Design a protein around this ligand. Structure first.
Ligand SMILES: S=c1[nH]c(-c2ccccc2)cs1
Ligand SMILES: [Zn+2]
Length: 256
């Protein structure tokens, strides 16, 4: 199946997922000089005070922190969005070295990693129906650079040794995603897709301009995870990111 290696990586995805060559693919390079301030964007609203995490899972291409989204709780609204989008999960993409790992780039700069906080449009009733709609998901993308440690990330880092290999999961309650957010909510936004198969063109991307800092030790622990399952030859889970894709007929708007 699909992956990040020479024979199943991003250059191969279009064969099973022809949308890989579609008109609103992600990620993209954000040209900060060409992105235009949009005064019609409404204030962005990230309301995570009631977020309830359930579980953390190694799915063989990243790790997912999943939330109980059965009630109206952790909500993203405002900005480019119409209506309300409910937090369902987060995951990261990261590199083998600090100089690469992010999906989006900023004037061609690659960050060490990128956090994706995934929300679904409540007008569609659940996630599986939302992903079939062009406005079904809102993904808040946050860059990670290596420097000072992020205290709010440590609880994630410490659990990763219990989910080293594909298919392992662990209880992960009471995690507060507010501890993963930078000070500023300044953002760029554009219409795009998932950055992994099935590459569905259902995402309003909201990419924060301000990165969060994580320590070298924290990201090194991300890089100790495995793509393979238990009892299989070890392939370190690193470089689970896709090259930037053509912007095609799209505009990136700035909130600032
Ligand atoms: S990359 C990105 N991957 C997702 C996702 C969330 C749940 C299931 C499948 C994919 C949103 S952005
Ligand atoms: Zn992602």
């Amino acid at each position: 199946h699909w992956g990040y290696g020479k024979h199943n990586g991003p250059e191969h995805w279009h064969k099973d997922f022809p949308i890989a060559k579609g008109e609103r693919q992600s990620p993209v390079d954000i040209d900060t000089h060409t992105a235009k301030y949009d005064p019609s964007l409404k204030p962005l609203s990230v309301s995570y005070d009631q977020a309830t995490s359930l579980r953390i899972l190694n799915n063989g291409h990243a790790f997912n922190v999943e939330f109980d989204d059965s009630q109206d709780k952790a909500v993203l609204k405002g900005g480019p969005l119409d209506g309300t989008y409910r937090l369902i999960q987060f995951h990261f993409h990261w590199g083998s070295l600090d100089g690469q790992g992010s999906e989006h780039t900023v004037d061609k700069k690659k960050y060490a990693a990128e956090l994706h906080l995934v929300h679904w449009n409540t007008k569609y009733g659940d996630f599986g129906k939302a992903v079939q709609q062009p406005d079904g998901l809102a993904v808040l993308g946050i860059f990670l650079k290596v420097g000072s440690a992020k205290p709010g990330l440590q609880k994630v880092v410490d659990v990763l040794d219990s989910i080293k290999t594909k298919g392992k999961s662990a209880d992960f309650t009471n995690f507060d995603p507010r501890g993963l957010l930078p000070e500023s909510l300044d953002y760029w936004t554009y219409p795009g897709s998932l950055t992994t198969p099935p590459l569905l063109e259902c995402v309003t991307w909201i990419v924060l301009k301000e990165p969060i800092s994580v320590s070298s030790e924290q990201v090194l622990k991300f890089r100790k995870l495995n793509f393979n399952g238990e009892g299989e030859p070890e392939e370190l889970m690193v470089d689970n990111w896709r090259p930037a894709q053509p912007l095609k007929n799209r505009q990136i708007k700035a909130s600032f």
